[PDB]
């Protein structure tokens, strides 16, 4: 569901192969998945 | 040689700045840009045939040169992933120059990143630095990481001139990298 919301974000066309390869880069780079999770709520009203 | 690193590539070819071809292929052995019949199988990698300039171009003088270039491609231009690197190797008679750039190559005459080796493969793209900068991009660095590979086939790299005047330019894009950058952008990141 966390991966699904990311893929959902694909406002562009694709294929089953591209999607699997994206999940693969994410599975082998947990620090990248952490950034996407942190960016999802990083926006806040300052000053 | 080991499965788990298969990448889908979108190949776009331009004859004199004119898009004449575009195909997307996901092959475990990477691919090879050939300019002919699709025969000699002794070579590894999925053969992607560039079209004859006749069915798109009208100029007959240009069809001439492109046809010669495509003919000197022989084994072709091999490209494949292995580890954290993208590898390329030239198997024919035409020198090929590459550079990593934006989806749309800019005429910022700066010269090529290098030349594709013929004797042994050479690395043309490192996934490591790409992810490092993809992460800071999501943080706000404002600099989207590049992932598009551009190849000048048969002529020197168009440094002082517009690439659209080159006989054969090929743009290769690893679609998963394009997607990762788009998700970082839609997630709230700007350049």
UniProtKB/Swiss-Prot annotation, chain A:
Stretches that traverse the bilayer:
none
Post-translational modification here is noted as: Methylation of the KIX domain by CARM1 blocks association with CREB. This results in the blockade of CREB signaling, and in activation of apoptotic response. Sumoylation negatively regulates transcriptional activity via the recruitment of DAAX.
- Where are the Phosphoserine modifications? 12, 15
Q: Where in the cell is it found?
A: Cytoplasm; Nucleus
Record disease entry: Chromosomal aberrations involving CREBBP may be a cause of acute myeloid leukemias. Translocation t(8;16)(p11;p13) with KAT6A; translocation t(11;16)(q23;p13.3) with KMT2A/MLL1; translocation t(10;16)(q22;p13) with KAT6B. KAT6A-CREBBP may induce leukemia by inhibiting RUNX1-mediated transcription.
Q: What does this protein do?
A: Acetylates histones, giving a specific tag for transcriptional activation. Mediates acetylation of histone H3 at 'Lys-18' and 'Lys-27' (H3K18ac and H3K27ac, respectively). Also acetylates non-histone proteins, like DDX21, FBL, IRF2, MAFG, NCOA3, POLR1E/PAF53 and FOXO1. Binds specifically to phosphorylated CREB and enhances its transcriptional activity toward cAMP-responsive genes. Acts as a coactivator of ALX1. Acts as a circadian transcriptional coactivator which enhances the activity of the circadian transcriptional activators: NPAS2-BMAL1 and CLOCK-BMAL1 heterodimers.
Task: Give the multimer and partner information.
Answer: Found in a complex containing NCOA2; NCOA3; IKKA; IKKB and IKBKG. Probably part of a complex with HIF1A and EP300. Interacts with GATA1; the interaction results in acetylation and enhancement of transcriptional activity of GATA1. Interacts with MAF and ZCCHC12. Interacts with DAXX; the interaction is dependent on CBP sumoylation and results in suppression of the transcriptional activity via recruitment of HDAC2 to DAXX. Interacts with phosphorylated CREB1. Interacts with CITED4 (C-terminal region). Interacts (via the TAZ-type 1 domain) with HIF1A. (Microbial infection) Interacts with HTLV-1 Tax, p30II and HBZ.
Q: What is this protein called?
A: CREB-binding protein
Q: Which organism is it from?
A: Homo sapiens
UniProtKB/Swiss-Prot annotation, chain B:
Q: Where are the Phosphothreonine residues found in this chain?
A: 42, 49, 58
Give the superkingdom in one word.
Eukaryota
Residues modified as Phosphoserine: 190-191
Region listing for Interaction with HERC5, in residue ranges? 5-165
Cross-link annotation Glycyl lysine isopeptide (Lys-Gly) (interchain with G-Cter in ISG15), location: 165, 171
Instruction: Please describe the quaternary structure of this protein.
Output: Monomer. Homodimer; phosphorylation-induced. Interacts (when phosphorylated) with CREBBP. Interacts with MAVS (via phosphorylated pLxIS motif). Interacts with TICAM1 (via phosphorylated pLxIS motif). Interacts with STING1 (via phosphorylated pLxIS motif). Interacts with IKBKE and TBK1. Interacts with TICAM2. Interacts with RBCK1. Interacts with HERC5. Interacts with DDX3X (phosphorylated at 'Ser-102'); the interaction allows the phosphorylation and activation of IRF3 by IKBKE. Interacts with TRIM21 and ULK1, in the presence of TRIM21; this interaction leads to IRF3 degradation by autophagy. (Microbial infection) Interacts with rotavirus A NSP1 (via pLxIS motif); this interaction leads to the proteasome-dependent degradation of IRF3.
Family that this chain belongs to: Belongs to the IRF family.
Q: What protein does this entry describe? A: Interferon regulatory factor 3
Which span of the entire protein is present here? 196 to 386 of 427
């Amino acid at each position: 569901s966390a991966l699904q919301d990311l893929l959902r974000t694909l406002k562009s066309p694709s294929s089953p192969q591209q999607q699997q390869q994206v999940l693969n880069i994410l599975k082998s780079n947990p620090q990248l998945m952490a950034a996407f999770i942190k960016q999802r709520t990083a926006k806040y009203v300052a000053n | 040689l080991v499965p788990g690193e298969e990448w889908e590539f979108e190949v776009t070819a331009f004859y004199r700045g004119r898009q004449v071809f575009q195909q997307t292929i996901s092959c475990p052995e990477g691919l090879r840009l050939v300019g002919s019949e699709v025969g000699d199988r002794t070579l590894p990698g999925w053969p992607v045939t560039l079209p004859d300039p006749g069915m798109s171009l009208t100029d007959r003088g240009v069809m001439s040169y492109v046809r010669h270039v495509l003919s000197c491609l022989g084994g072709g231009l091999a490209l494949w992933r292995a580890g954290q690197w993208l590898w390329a190797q030239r198997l024919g008679h035409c020198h090929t120059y590459w550079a990593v750039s934006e989806e749309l190559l800019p005429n910022s005459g700066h010269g090529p990143d290098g030349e594709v080796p013929k004797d042994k493969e050479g690395g043309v793209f490192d996934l490591g630095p790409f992810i490092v900068d993809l992460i800071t991009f999501t943080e706000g660095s404002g600099r989207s990481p590049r992932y598009a590979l551009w190849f000048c086939v048969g002529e020197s790299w168009p440094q002082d001139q517009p690439w659209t005047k080159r006989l054969v330019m090929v743009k290769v894009v690893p679609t998963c990298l394009r997607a990762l950058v788009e998700m970082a952008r839609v997630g709230g990141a700007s350049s």
